[PDB]
Ligand binder design. Structure first.
Ligand SMILES: [Ca+2]
Ligand SMILES: [Ca+2]
Ligand SMILES: [Ca+2]
Ligand SMILES: [Zn+2]
Ligand SMILES: [Zn+2]
Length: 158
């Protein structure tokens, strides 16, 4: 599958969910990128204008792609694999209630999963992997990638 062929990757937060404080959205997304830069040669930088590699969007229902959202529950977010244009972009369903903690749906944990897709990972069959396809809260302050996630990403980078 596709991978980024450069080490400096940019992201941009297109818009902000009203569910959270702005600074908390920024921090959750930054921390999620750091999870992956920790285990690859990739470097991620936030930009505020122009075209980023990875555009982060909060949207509800139909929102201009083939992965229409479905209201509260069900699909929480989705992301495109590496490539030009919409490639890399990560979309979060605004019909969820995003949080910094164990209430609602944790943005950081969901972003770690989606960014995994943005970098070219697929799903894992291992329930302990962040790339497992059902959300579960785990303490975000002590979060660590599973061995399965590390093997997955290091098959693509580094
Ligand atoms: Ca893109
Ligand atoms: Ca949904
Ligand atoms: Ca919401
Ligand atoms: Zn979308
Ligand atoms: Zn997924």
């Amino acid at each position: 599958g596709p991978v980024w062929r450069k080490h400096y990757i940019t992201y941009r937060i297109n818009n902000y969910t009203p569910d959270m404080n702005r600074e908390d959205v920024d921090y959750a997304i930054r921390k999620a990128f750091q999870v992956w830069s920790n285990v690859t040669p990739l470097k991620f930088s936030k930009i505020n204008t122009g075209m980023a590699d990875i555009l982060v969007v909060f949207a509800r229902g139909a929102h201009g792609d083939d992965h229409a959202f479905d209201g509260k529950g069900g699909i929480l977010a989705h992301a495109f694999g590496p490539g030009s244009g919409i490639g890399g972009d990560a979309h979060f369903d605004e019909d969820e209630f995003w949080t910094t903690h164990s209430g609602g749906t944790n943005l950081f944990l969901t972003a770690v999963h989606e960014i995994g897709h943005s970098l070219g990972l697929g799903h894992s069959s291992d329930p302990k992997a962040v790339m497992f396809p059902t959300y579960k809260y785990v303490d975000i302050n002590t979060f660590r990638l599973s061995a399965d996630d590390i093997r997955g990403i290091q098959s693509l980078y580094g």
